[PDB]
Every structure is written in structure tokens, then in C-alpha cells.
Symmetry: T
Subunit: 169 residues, 12 copies
């Protein structure tokens, strides 16, 4: 009765983080920020390919590139919001961004170059977030669900890029 309340009153400023939070909060925060860097890098890369993919066939890829780009930023916003709830700071610094990220920014010369670099990044993110989802287990459903939702989106991005690549050269 009053013990339910006393548990909640202890360390109240910790907010979303309760007596029941069983995950390794600092390590989760580290992973959230690595993912955030990946999303920002993927956002900048896709935006680049979008502007550069001109032409008839390429304009189709350009549309997918832009759609992907803005989804990446949605993933970034989702992750930063969680970083804040779990007592961290989201790192939007462009300095060293690529070093924190699992993906690279690669301009590419051809369209096949562009698509391949995006496909490579998605497959890196897929396996990375699969590992994080496994690592979280049942200790942090709310964070686990963020990565599960991002994962499902990345799997779509991978298929969308691979579908294009098969038609190229």
C-alpha cells in the first residue's frame, strides 16, 4: 500500500527510471548514442544521394533515398528522446560523428555506388540492432521496442535498396 508509494518516492527525480529498471542504464545509454550517430550519418548520406541522383531511372531511386533519409531522422529523434528519459545526453556533434557511428558517409560516383553504400549501411544496422535487441532481453521493454521498430524499418530499407541494385549492373 504505502510501500508501493515509498518505492516510487525513493529517488523520484530519476523519473522514468524506477526501482524496477533492471537494465544496465549506462550501457543502454552508450548503445542509444552509437545508434543516434549511425542514424545521423545515414541521414546525411541519403540526403546527398537524393540531390545527386538525377535522370529518369535515377529519379526513382532519389525518391526512395529521400524517404529513407527522413525515416533515419525519425529514428534519430526516437533515440535521442529515450536518451533523455534514461538520464543521458544525446550527442549531435558532427565532429567525430562518423567515428561513433557503425556506418560511413560515402558520396559514391555512380548510382550503383550510391545504392550499394546505402544497402551496406542498412545491413550493418540490421545486425547491430539485432544484437542490441538480444542484449536488452526483457530488462527494458520500452527501449527494446524502439530498436524492434527501427529494425523492422531498416529491413525494409535493405530490401528496397537490394531490389534496386538487382536491376542495375
Amino acid at each position: 500500500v504505502q510501500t508501493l508509494r515509498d518505492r516510487a518516492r525513493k529517488n523520484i527525480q530519476e523519473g522514468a527510471v524506477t526501482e524496477g529498471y533492471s537494465a544496465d542504464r549506462q550501457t543502454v545509454l552508450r548503445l542509444l548514442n552509437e545508434a543516434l550517430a549511425t542514424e545521423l550519418v545515414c541521414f546525411l548520406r541519403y540526403k546527398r544521394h537524393y540531390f545527386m541522383a538525377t535522370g529518369l531511372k535515377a529519379s526513382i531511386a532519389a525518391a526512395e533515398f529521400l524517404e529513407h533519409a527522413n525515416q533515419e531522422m525519425q529514428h534519430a529523434d526516437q533515440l535521442a528522446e529515450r536518451i533523455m528519459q534514461l538520464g543521458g545526453e544525446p550527442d549531435f556533434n558532427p565532429r567525430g560523428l562518423e567515428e561513433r557511428s557503425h556506418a560511413e558517409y560515402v558520396e559514391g560516383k555512380t548510382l550503383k555506388d550510391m545504392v550499394t553504400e546505402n544497402l551496406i549501411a542498412e545491413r550493418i544496422a540490421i545486425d547491430s540492432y539485432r544484437e542490441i535487441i538480444t542484449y536488452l532481453g526483457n530488462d527494458d521493454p520500452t527501449t527494446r521496442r524502439i530498436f524492434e521498430e527501427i529494425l523492422a524499418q531498416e529491413e525494409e530499407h535493405a530490401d528496397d535498396m537490394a531490389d534496386i541494385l538487382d536491376d542495375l549492373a
Copy 2:
């Protein structure tokens, strides 16, 4: 540089990465069986929607149509995943019922119609529960598709049972 090499190996496989620990072949078979089930349930509900005329029946007819269209959304969801996992979705009407866990049943009465839909929903619920168990933690993206469909079928079952209890 090995993360990049892991990703470059079998790049044409797309969403299916080295870390995909499920039996891709078996998941594809289950996805197509679900797809057939959803198309069959769509056709049955669409039949019942048109045939359920009257004062009281027209209320059931509305639910029939809502379910039919939800079934088609499930079909699209499953087919999309079949493609991401490197399969082919089988929309062939020939042998459609043999592939499906459900049946197409016209019914003579409205109680017939509701009962046949209720039976189909309960077949799907237990079938998809088993698939979700089979997937476990190997394919979250597919597991989440079936979990979302499952929740809908549970709604469809309650809606049909709620009606059936009021009938003759």
C-alpha cells in the same frame, strides 16, 4: 572493416543478414499459408457482407465488411514480408483453400455465417499463436507482424461471438 565485410557478403539477400537466425525457408512457407488464410477469409466475409440483408443482419453485414478489409490488409502485410525474406507470395486461386487453414463457407442463415467466421478466427488465433512460438527471438520483424495480426483476429473473434450469443 569486418562489419562492412559481413554486410557485403551475400549483399543481394537484402534484409536477410548473416545475423538472421531463423529458418528462412520455413518462415516463408508459414507466411504463404497465412497469406492463403487471409485471402480465403476475405472472400468468405465479402460473400457474407453481400448476402446479409435485413434490419438486424445489416449490422452484421457492416462488421463482415470491416473484417474483410482487415483481412486484406493482413494479406498485404504478409506478402510484403514474403518479399523481404526472398520468397514469392502465392495469390493463385487454384488450390487456395488447400493452402489455407480456413475454409470458404457460404452459409444458408445468418447464424451459419457468423458461426463459420467465428470458427475461422479461432483457427487463425491458435495457428498464429503457434507460429509466434516457433519464431521466438529469431525474427522479431516477422514475429511482430504475426503478433499484430493475432491481436486483430482476437478482436474479430470477440466481435463474431458477441453477435452469435444474441442469435437463435
Copy 3:
């Protein structure tokens, strides 16, 4: 009195939309409506199959048309079933024997040219079938005639849309 218009309407009142003035062969029009319904359901399934399988840069353009066509087909299916019910029939959504009732076929195709060609064939079959139905109806059933005349126009668009693609292929 003018009580004769009312007496006409009261006779066989449960027949609903079908009045004394309905001059068509109701049983046959219902047969044609159900054959048309089967054709649309098949065409819907074929187009959806092609939509999911047509991946790539060029093909994704075709896939969009395939999906647009698919849903137009189901709209036709709904129009026809609605009319079947108004004329006192039962619409047959049974997938068993669906192809046997249909003027069209379900064909997966291997290439994109295969998919486009098969859809073009189905449309040209439907166009000529529905022209024949429209003629059979004559002035006996304006409401049913108008459904097929409207579907016909959609099919001519689908045929032109698929042919326009096929000319650019291989």
C-alpha cells in the same frame, strides 16, 4: 383510377428493384454478372501478384500501375456483386473453380514482359466480353448496361496502360 400504377407496384412487391417493366432475362443477366465477378476477382489476384514481384527501378513503375489496376478490379467486383443482389441473385466469391467461371486466367509470369503481356491479354478479353454483354442487354436493363459500360471504359484504359508499357520493353 391512377390506382393502376400503384397496383403494378404492389404485385410481386418483394422482387424489389425488379419491377413488371424489367424486360431482360433476369436469370441470364445474373449469370453474366457472376462470370464478370469471377473475371474481376482473378484479375485482382493476378495484378496483386505482379505488384509484389515487380521490383527494381523500371519495374517499380509497372508495379504502381499493377496495384492501381488491382484495386480498380475489386471496385468492379463490388459493383457487380451489388447488382447481383439487387436482381435477386447470389454473388459467387468461392475460390474453388474461380478460374473456370472467369474469362481471364491467373498467370504468375517469369519476366516483367510476361506480367505485362498477361495483363494486356486479360484486359482485351474483358473488353470484348463486356462489349458483347452490353449488346445483349440493349435497352432492356439500363442500370446493368451502365455498369458494364463504365467497367468497359476502365478496361480500355487498363489495356492502353499495359500496351504503352509493353511497347517500351523487349
Copy 4:
């Protein structure tokens, strides 16, 4: 062949939509449009009466249909009045003698079966009435024919909807 198309159009220019090529009997087409208009106004009033009076769980389903029908009837009224004006007539909205001009009646009914049955009778009267008008017009006035053909298709739907209800009652 240019100045003769123009001279054709300049003659009786005040006739508006009604050109030399208008092969129908304008005076009679106007009579039929105004009878149709009275029928639609009457059917609107009857349905509105039934809408307000049909209370209860089961009745409210019919009442919803009564209202949809009522408002479709007024749409038909506007469509017909609009055409009357294009053909140089005057639409008669006068409530005095409205029923005598109409093919339908205003009938309150006591029961829901009464109300549904009376609406079903009126829809079936309109169907055959408008079928005859469509035949009378033939190819002489496509624009007026298409109005009646569009109204007819709606009346057939209204008849089916009322009959579908009556089967659950009688």
C-alpha cells in the same frame, strides 16, 4: 461550312441549350420532368416523416435508410429542376396539388411495416415510370435521358434496400 455552323447557332440564340438539332418534344419533356419533380418532392416528404417516426433499436436502422433516401430524393429534385430551366420551363415546387402531379403519394403509415411497404411501392412506381420516360426519349435527348438513367439506378437501389428490410418484417 464555317459560316453555316455559325448561322445555325445564331438563329433563335435565346433558346440556349435547345439548338436546331434538339429532336425531342420540348413541351412534353418539360411535362415529364415536372411530374418527376413532384414525385421526388413527395417522396422526400414521406421519407422525412418516416425518419422522425421510426424510433427504437430495429426501427432506427430503417430510419437511417429513410433519411439517406430522403436526401437522395431531394438531389433528384434539384437535378430535374436544373434541367427544366435549361429546356426553358418553370419547375413547379407548389405544395398545392403536389400529389396530383406526382406518381407517388404521401402516406404516413402506422407501423414500420406500413412505412417500409409504402416506400417500396413508391420506388417501384418511379422505376417503371422512369423506364418509360427513358424509352420515350430514345436518342432524341441524351442529356435528359442520362438524368433519368442516373435517377433510375438510384431508385433501383432504394427499392432493393426497402425490400431487403421488408423481408425481415412481413
Copy 5:
């Protein structure tokens, strides 16, 4: 009996909407579609001119009708060009000789009554032209017939709207 339906469809398959059953004179139907297209383009330009020139209190009322008509005329143009393409023709948007191909003329007018009358004349020319076309088509080409029936009905509205204004002048 199913392979012969398929054989009919394969013969001349590139002709698209035009099937073995198409019983109209395709070449002549196309000529009529192109004459109608010119009529609509001419009527569009004339109405647009009258719209801009019809200033004042009362005239602004006619000007609104002029603009609504102009844009309906272009919709008619679009319908006809779409049909020209389905039947294997070419829609002629060439401004050179546009008036010669058209049943109508471009006429500036000095007064508002000038403008309204010229528009009324054009609508009455189109009405009788399209009635003749609809008759020529008969039951041979429902899809084209329905286009002209739909355009005709709009032209009758335009004719009545212009005549209703002219009666006040």
C-alpha cells in the same frame, strides 16, 4: 474454348484498348476527336480572354462564369486527348491552324454583350456537333460516345448559363 478468347486477344495485341470487337471506324473517330480537341482549346483561349477583360460590378459576375467555363473546356480537351491516345492517334495541340481545325472561332468582342453572345454561339455549335458525333458513333464505341455525351451535357449547361446572362442585356 478458353484458348480462342486468348488468341483473339493476342492478335494485334499492341493495339491495346482497340480489340477485335471494336466496330467503329477508328481513323474517323480519331479525326472527330482531334476536331473536338481544337474546339475546346479555342473555346478555352476565348473564355480566358473574356475573363480578364470583363471588369466591373455586373461584368465580374459574367467573368466568374467565363473562368469556370474556360477550365471545363480544358478538362474536355484533356478527356479527348486521353481518348485519342487510347485509340492510337496523336492529339494536335499545335496553335498553328488551331482555329481551322476547330468548329469554333476566337472572337475578342468589344462589349460584354459581344463576349457573352460569342460564347453562346460557340456552345450551340459544339452542342449540335457533338450530337452529330454521338449519333455517328451509335453502339460501335460506347467509351467514346460516353465522353461526348458527358461533354455535350456540360455544353448545354454552358449554353444555358450564357443565354441566361444575355437575356438581361
Copy 6:
């Protein structure tokens, strides 16, 4: 306690009509149906005028006529709904409709005729509904508010028609 509920269960099928309803229900119902007849008549008269008022200036009146007609029907619906709540039957019968109504259906020959006839009807309704509002007093707020809302609308309809009539012949 048990009397608040006992007052409400007694005569429960009388619905909105409670023990506290202090108005002369039968008379309120009579007035509601007379008002309903008036609105139906005014609806038909305005619709007649709307279709017949063609021309440059007349089309401006035609638009006001249509707005008025459709407001009249809203009033008809408002009143019929209230008749049902108070235990009556709304009379939509076209036979003898004018005999029940305070206003008349008048085709009019000229536009000034049409405007004048509408203005006369609005001023009849205004004075009728003011008397009903006074008659109701505080005995039936819900019904009173219906008439106060209709009255305000009729005052607008009257001002709109008089504004037109001042500019005429």
C-alpha cells in the same frame, strides 16, 4: 434520496418530459407543427425562386435564396426533432400544408416580386416566433431556445431581403 429517483421512474416512458415540465405540452406541440409547416412552405418558395432567378444581378439573389431555403429546412428538422421529444407527430403532409402555415407559396413574376414575397414571409415568422417565445416564458427553455435561434436567423433573412429590395425597381 429515494424521491429524486421516484419522481424520475414515475411515467418514465414520457422521456424528456419530466415531472418538472411546466409548459402546456399539447399547445407547444401545436405551435411546433404550425412552425414546421411554415418552414416547409418557405423552403419550397425559396427553391422555386432560386431556380427562376437567372441573370447577372438576379443570380446574386438566387444565391441568397438557396442559402435561405436550406436554412429553412434546418429549421424544419430542428422543430420536427422537438416534436418527437415532446410526444407528438411531425406533419410533413403536402396536402393542406399552406393552410397550416403562417406563410404562403408565391411564385412571383419579377425578381422584385420574389424578394418582396420572401420578405413578407420572414416578417410574418419573426412576429409569430416572438409571440411563441413570449408565450413559452421560462416553462420550456429547451423549446424556447429553438425558437430564439430560429428567430435570429429569420431576422437575418429579413434584413438580407430588404437590403436587396432597396436596390430594385
Copy 7:
């Protein structure tokens, strides 16, 4: 002459909407608003319960009305709480003693006829309560009177809607 209108406005300025001219008994009006607020909150909970429990074909129609009423009750609750704040009070949303404060009861009902009857009883209690409040206010507080007059008209509708259902039942 402008300095006295301003001086009246400066006297007790923090009282806000409540001016020197407010002629009602602020304390008592606040009591009635809070009693009404409890009534609406209880009615919201009752209707919500009935909405979820009324399953079946015919019953689902009542469930739709139950939900609509439920949410209209909460709009009334908000309207009343908004006014309580303007008159310098505190709106009591405490679930403890909510029924003791409310003019209506929460009653689960066993049957649909039960549910409808209990809702119908509550509406008729509210009607007579709010009519009495409207009389008590007189011309002293138009802004509050208008809240109750608007709620009253809504309750008369809810009462009629429930009674219309009850007549068709058992």
C-alpha cells in the same frame, strides 16, 4: 466619469469574472456546479460501463448511443469545471464520495433493458435538477444559466433517445 467605471473594476480585481455587478450567491452557485459536476462524472462512468457490456446485434446500437452520451457527459463535466474556476472555486473530481455528491447513481444493470432504464432514470433526474437550478439563477448569472440551459437541452435528448429504445424492448 471614466474614473469610476475604472475604480469599480479595480476594486477586488483578482476576483476576475466576478465583478461588482455579479448579483448571484457565488458560494451557492459554486456548490450547485460541483454537485452537477459529480452527476456528470458518475453518468460518464455508468454509460461507459454500459457501452462495453452491451454486446450483440441489437444491443450494439444501444452501445453506440451509450458511448455518445458518455462523451457528451464528459463535455458537460468540463463545461462545469471551467465555470467553477471562473467563479473562484475548486472542482471536485475526487472519486471518494462521488456518488454521495451526485444526483444520479452508477448502476451496472444485468440486462440491456436494465442498462437503458437506469440511464433513462438518470437523465430524468438531471433534467429536473437542472431546471430547478436554472430557476434559482434567474437573471443573476446569465453565463452560468446558459451552461445549464445547454446541458438541459442535451439531457432532454438523452432522455428521449433512451426512452425511444426502451419502448421497443421487453
Copy 8:
């Protein structure tokens, strides 16, 4: 035919019928004084809206703008009625403040701005309460306008007082 004769006499008076029992001339005077008040209050609120910058103040600034546009809606309501009753609405900025029950006051601080708006609302509340009493049952349509405006001013007064209590 007597109802018709009543309506035909003085037909150009429009909404004002034989049964209009209010003092039309005096009602027009009050509508125009109220109109002036609303225009003045609109300008003052707009002034405060632009001048209330900062973290806290921007919250008040949003309220200032909302109030401002509501004031103009009232001006529109009042002018519409002035026309229906056969008058002329006075939008002249010369002497606008003399006709208005409220003042235009710039204020130096935010507390100044809030206090001045609160003073104006309480002036209008009591002014319109008096007008509603004067009308009684003689002019329902006009009475309802003032009753609707009055309720809005009470909200504005409560909203401003709610801000003032938190300030200084």
C-alpha cells in the same frame, strides 16, 4: 391576410417588425458604444501581443492575441446587428476612445499590460450585464449577442486574473 398586412406595413424596416418592442434608437446607441469598446480592446491587446516578449511573457502574448481576435469577432457581431436594426456602425478612429467604455493603455511592464486588460474586461462585463437587463425580453436576438459576448469577457477576465496572481 391580416398577418400579411402587418408584414407589408413598413416592409423596408426588414428585421424590425411591428412586434419589435425595444427602443430601437437606444439599442443602436449601445451597440455602437459596445462596438467602440471592442475595437479599442482589439488594438490594446494587439499592442501587448507584439510587446510581450520573453520566456514567461510569450505565454501571455499568446493569450493577448487570442483575446484580440475574439474582440474583433464581437465587433463584427455588433456591427452586423447595427445594420439589421437600421443603423450605421461607427468605425471612425476619431473619438473611438470617447465612445468606448475601455481605454487604450500601452503599459510599461507585463504586469501593467495584464492589469489593464483585466480592468477593461471587468468594465465590459458590468456594462454588458446592464445592457442585458435593459433589453429584458424586448429584443431576444440582441440580448443573445450580449449574453454571448458577456460570457467571452468573463473568460477573458478569468484568464487575465489567473496570470496576474502569479506575477508581482
Copy 9:
């Protein structure tokens, strides 16, 4: 093999969404669903009280969060009640004993800091309460688990939003 899947579904058919394969303790899941329902109804009432009472410049920002939270609480209430029905229970909206059933309390608060603190305490009680329920369900009831996982995530947001405010206060 088709008649055995079908026989499974006919056994206990009236149970609806609850199939032979449902491996949870339906009785207990329903108990927890109803305790959650009470918690959300109480949290809704508390937040609504705070919304209306939190006046002022800074406080109005909190008031907005209070209202957004309140309506999210009611959405949770509806989700939970819907599930109670599917599992064959009855959702308890009775205000009598509502607080005894709820894991949270209704607390008026005197200051804004009071209000924020009480809301924050409530969210943290809910967070840990629903985490325990998610554990209890395991893999036995995905559909119910997902409801709680979705609610949990919202409560974590509500906790962060209230704590973010409290850090700036007094």
C-alpha cells in the same frame, strides 16, 4: 487434418478470442486488467483536477501536460476495458471503491510542486506495477502483454515529463 483444426475451434466456441491455445490464467489476467483500469481512471481524475487548478503563466505549461496525460490515461482505460471484454470479464467503472482497486491515489495537492510530485509518484507506481504484469504474462498472452508494453512506454514518458518539470521548481 482440416476437420481437427475445425473441431478445436467449435469446442467452447462462445469463448471467442480465448481459444484452446490460450495458456494464461484468464481469471488472474482479468483481475490485473481491472486493477489497471482502476489505476487509469483515478490517474485521469487526478490529472483533470490538476489541469483546472494549475493557473498562471508557468503553471499553464504544466496544465497543458496535465491534460495531455489525462486523456492518454483514458485511452489506456479504454484499451484495458476492451481487453477485459475479449477475455470474458466485466470492466469495473464503479466509482465506489475505485481508489481501493487502484495502485495510485487521487491527491488534490496545494501547490504546483505538490501536483507535479503526486503525478510523478503515480507514474512511477504504474511503471513498476505494469513491468511486473508484463513479466507475469510472459509468452502466454501476447495480445494482453502488448497492451501493457504500450501503456508502460507511455507511463515512462509521463514520468520523465513530470520529473523534467519538478527539477525546475522549488
Copy 10:
């Protein structure tokens, strides 16, 4: 370091509270503010005049003018808002005081008796604003693009209002 780019930033830190007004602002801030406020007064007067004409223009033909009057009135207020917004960005105070509003405004409030009066009075005001704002645009030159663009956008609207009113007046 190497006070390079560090110079762009040191320019920005100086007088930071001056906000939009930077070291690069080459216009006479004091004078631009006077002009913005005169324009603001002009628009408020034009709004009140047009609103007056809207309510008084009853009749068949007049109601068409009444519609134009109302569209114009609300555009005038949009202009007033645009100008007041700029006054704040440049560190001024926008004067909404109705006392002396006309003395500050380039236009007049004129009731007019007839519709022809109303149309003419609005037409005169537009032509005053057109030439006033042309002069202001010229005075600004290239010193304040953001303020110039406000006046250029208002100017184009006033030219439309002028043409709209003249088109009506020709028929009277």
C-alpha cells in the same frame, strides 16, 4: 585562435541584444522605424474604412463591392501585422493607439454616402499608399533587404486593390 573566423564571431558577440540588427545593418534604424509606424497607422485606418464600407454596402450590385471591401480589409490587417512584426525585430514599439491614428496615417477614414463615394475613397487611399511605399522602397535601397521586401510585397497588393477598386468605379 589566429583571430580568423574568430572575427565573424566577435562581430556577432558585440551588442548581442540588438538581435536582428547586426553590425552590417547599414540603414538608419531610427528612420526606418518611423516609416514602419506611419505605414502601420495607414493600414489600420484603411482596415477600419474598408470594414465600415463592407457593412454599409447593401444591395445586389453593392454586395459584390462589399465582398471586395472585406477581402481588402483583412489584407490591410495582414499588412499591419507584417509591419508591426518588423518594428519589433528592429527594436521599436508599434503604435496601435487610436488617439491620433489618422494624423500618423497617410490615408483617411471616410464614411462616404453612396457606393461610388466608398469606392472612390478606397481608390484614393490605395494610390496614396502605392506612391508612399514606392518612396519608402526607394529610400531603403540595398540597406535593408528584409524591410524592403515587406514593402515590395505590400506594394504589389495595394496595386491590386487599386485596380480592383478602379475596375468597379468605371461602371458607376
Copy 11:
């Protein structure tokens, strides 16, 4: 000061054209009508290309053709509106339309033909409108802004067509 108004009263019927209008109005009107013809011609050419560009790749260009066509008409409307404000008459006559225009109507046979002809026309318009913008200088801000808004639109159209042509 009473002179501000007398300036505005002189030649009042000229409307937007005031004493301060320093441009050569007759010449501005000539340029506006030449631009109008250019837009009308470009509109017809684009529509022709839209209907004729069938196929997979071509349908992409066809969509751009239609967007451009309708933008061309928006420009035509902008220019005609300005002709009226400045006291001219807009010439929509199809006879001699091409002679008045800086562009041509060219059907083209291939898609490369169509795209090239559009690109050529856009570059003609760009340099024409740059010259007009220069001729206007500061004498007519309102007309100058119309051409600058169109110019930027034409630069987009040129880039869009060149982007397509590079792939052929």
C-alpha cells in the same frame, strides 16, 4: 498634405498606375504580352509531349511535362493579370501566337527530341526574362517581381529537363 490626396485624385481611373509609376508603361505592356504568348505556346508544347510520352521511362518525363505545362499556365495568368492592372489587353489569340512568342511549338518524334525542345525553350525564356528584369530596374518593382518569380521557375524547368537529357 491635402496634396497627397490631390496627387491621388488626378487621373484616378488609371488605378494601380500612379504619378509615381516611373516605367515606360506601354513598353512594359508589350513585353508582358510577348511573355504571355511564350507561356501559352510552352503550355501547348508540354501538353502535347505529356500525352505522347508513353512507356516506363517516358512516363516519368511525362509527369514532369504536365507539372511544367500547368506552371506555364500559372505564369500566363500572372502576366495577363498584370497587363490588366497596367491598362492593356492580354492577347490570347491563337493566330500568330507563335510569332509573338520567343518559343516554338515542336512536336518532336523521340523522347530525346521532346526533352531537348523543352530545354531549348526554357533557356530562351531565361535569357529573355533576365533582359526584361534588367530593363525594368527599379522603375516597376511589382512587375519586376513577377518576372523574377517566373525566371526562377524557368531555371528549375531547365535543370529538370537537362537532368533528363543527360541520361539519354
Copy 12:
């Protein structure tokens, strides 16, 4: 005549850039890319401040921080679109982003810190883009108008940030 067409055909692949383009294309591209980097940096800084500014008062600034962030990205898109039209490549590389930009990414500790850094950045951009507008003169209206439109937005951002700082400093 035939020379307008020949002028347009020369260097046709240059697209928007015609013979009449009198600006230094190479330099305009350099300036556009410096602005592009500035906007990307300002976007990241504002997003960081948005997530970190929690509390009652701080949430007001956070809302503005977010509105600014998204306006900055709109500016980035405008600038990149023009870079492509003038035949350049837009540089979205996070590597060296700050070195190319007139602005910096600065986390700040306090809200006063965040607001001040945003205010400084806007004032740098304001004066930088004013200079670019002068450099363009009348040689490139389309680009000048882009910067003139961005400038007006930056002036708003500066006023909005300064309005906040006055309440803090």
C-alpha cells in the same frame, strides 16, 4: 529568331545556367556550399538544445529551438537544390562540416549558454548572407532571392533568441 535558338543550344547541358548568366558560377557554388554547411551545423546545434532544454520555462525555448532547427534544414534543402541547378555538388559530409561553416556546434551548459550560442550564430549568418546578397548584385536574381528569403528568416531567429536572452541575462 534562329539565333535565340542557337544561343540556347550552345552548352545546352548547362541547364539553368545560360549565356546570360553573368555571375561567377564557381564562386556562387562555393558560397552556397558554405551556407549549406552553416545550416547543417545550426540544425544539429538546435536539435541538441531542443532535447536538453527541459523544465517549465526551458520548454518554451525548446519549442523555438525545434522550430528553428527545422527551418534550418529547409534552408539546407533550398541551398542544395540551387547547388544542383548551377552544376555543383552539395557537400553533406559530416567530416570537416564545421570547418566549412560560418557557425559552430556548441553544446552549452545552461539555457543562457544555449540561447546565446544560437543568437551568435544567427548574427553571423545575417551578416554573412547580407554580404553574399551584395556580391550577387543583379547577376543572379534566382540565387539572390534564396539568400534574401533565408536572411529574413535568420533575422526572425535572431530576434526570437534575443527576446529570450533579455529575460535571462
